[model samples]
Target: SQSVEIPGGGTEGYHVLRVQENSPGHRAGLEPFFDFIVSINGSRLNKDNDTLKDLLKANVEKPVKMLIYSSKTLELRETSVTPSNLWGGQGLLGVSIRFCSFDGANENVWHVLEVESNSPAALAGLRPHSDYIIGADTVMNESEDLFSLIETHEAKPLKLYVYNTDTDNCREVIITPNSAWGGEGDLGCGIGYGYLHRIPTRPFE
Candidate 1:
């Protein structure tokens, strides 16, 4: 991650510190809020003038340290925690299985963002906004992506790397597959319905 500086003040707001495409945050999460600057690896951010170029130049895989002070104690207590993506596969000691839609842009990517309650994913400590890079050995194929892996394997165990945003470290996890609610076979997941250029649909064709 990179170092940045921002104007300090006594207000309630948030800003996106960093983002990873196809990761947990990008899947179902939103960007960082305004007025809340983020620091990574001990470096502060200047949100008002910082550009995407700054973030692209930084190494996001590094540990991130955030410093936030809010006008109200409640705001401080309600700080949002960013999720990490594991690269080498490890951390999944306990968790449960759940389903999520993936039909939107870049839906082929597999991200382990939120774990379901009382399911195998949650019991294993799997969290929201974690990136998942499927492996051929785990998914029972030579492909590294989710789409091909899903088609090649049935209900089985999968290995993944769990990202720790706070520590900026990577952990590995092994997850078992379940039957997807709307998809074929036992994958236990759904897909998005594509992007929404217009709401409630347009006039009739």
Candidate 2:
């Protein structure tokens, strides 16, 4: 398996999934689905989810410093937030956060395992077992939507954005699926999903 790159210097933390408007998290520039809290109060974040919960409990109405990693920009920045339940939202910071590993950072992707010879996918230059389908019509949409999308565009060229493990690069590939191409499937490629097929996270040194 190829090693996937981790942004923000590999500092693991709580993955922010949601931020309530007018809340402390929102005011502090915390973005949902694109930000990860790497540290708090100048200390490395604990791996446990409750660590954040209990920490916030102690910091209510107090200024707390945080180190955040933005997945979209691949950069880390610091922000100050004063957690207060009176902000009229759930939680002190009014954010939904969860502790996750490297693999969890990238959950919306389909792994490309095998490509049949002379198949539409191969003709489109999809590398077997190395390329990951990240998006179809938009950035990192649902994996289930990909199946229906292929059916929706039968015999028509479907553009896909793929990322390569070995090259650490992304490209656009257009695949025209033809069931009569003398293949078992429309694209004649094996796509794997779920946790088993998730991109392997880089192990600690």
- For each candidate, give its TM-score against the true structure: 0.30, 0.51
Which digits, one per residue and each the tens of the lDDT, describe model 2 over residues 1-205? Answer: 3333433345467877668889999899886655788878876674675767777789988999998875434556789998888977788999987675433346677889899999999999999998878666544446677788788888998988776767654578899888888977899999999877755543112
Report clash pairs, candidate 2. none
- What tens-digit string does per-residue lDDT give for candidate 1 at 91-120? 111111112111121212244544545454
Q: Give the TM-score of candidate 1.
A: 0.30
Off by over 4 Å in 1: 1-109, 130-144, 180-205
lDDT of 1 at 143: 24
